[PDB]
Design a binder for this molecule. Structure first.
Ligand SMILES: Nc1nnc2ccccn12
Length: 182
């Protein structure tokens, strides 16, 4: 509907797949080559479904900060015959607050879904489902089950993936450029 939605759509149309684990269907962001991200609570195993195709997982790494605290991001390398567009230059280098973000979801339950969530706070610590978690972003939108993995963007930046909510607020795990150096 406006330039935030333009950037969000450009990301969704080229850099997402539908990932299915035993824990559900998730929006999954492809970042570069065969490397994608998904919330750690998806419990990625040795095999995952990508757009309903059985796919071997070559590597899966549940990220933690240097205090050994959960970050809720799992980096997955997929045994896929095709690379993602490289979007690493749209990842922030540092923790930050943002204005006027969009949360975008694409699953069987919620196809072509876009949500203007407004201001995004560097919230920091969250007890997420009982698990101490760091580098959490917060937005004041009543997100729901089905939105996990959803991409949080501003114009020109991919800043996080949706990992939870409390009924009134939503929470995303930060994406940082430093997670995807090779
Ligand atoms: N997954 C998720 N995102 N937002 C919420 C809110 C309530 C319950 C679950 N949620």
């Amino acid at each position: 509907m406006g330039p935030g939605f333009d950037f969000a759509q450009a990301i969704m149309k080229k850099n997402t797949v539908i990932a299915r684990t035993e824990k559900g269907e998730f929006t999954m962001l492809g970042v570069y080559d065969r490397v994608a991200v998904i919330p750690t609570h998806a419990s990625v195993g040795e095999i995952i479904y990508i757009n309903d195709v059985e796919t071997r997982v070559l590597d899966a790494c549940a990220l933690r900060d240097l205090t050994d605290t959960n970050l809720e991001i799992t980096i997955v390398k997929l045994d896929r015959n095709q690379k993602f567009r490289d979007i690493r230059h749209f990842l922030p280098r540092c923790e930050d607050d943002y204005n006027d973000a969009v949360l975008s979801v694409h699953t069987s339950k919620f196809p072509n879904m876009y949500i203007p969530v407004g201001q995004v706070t560097n919230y920091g610590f969250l007890n997420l489902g009982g698990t101490p978690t760091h580098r959490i972003l917060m937005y004041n939108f009543p997100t729901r089950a089905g939105q996990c993995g959803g991409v949080v963007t501003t114009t020109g930046k991919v800043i996080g993936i949706h990992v939870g909510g409390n009924g009134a607020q939503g929470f995303a795990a930060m994406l940082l450029h430093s997670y995807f150096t090779d």
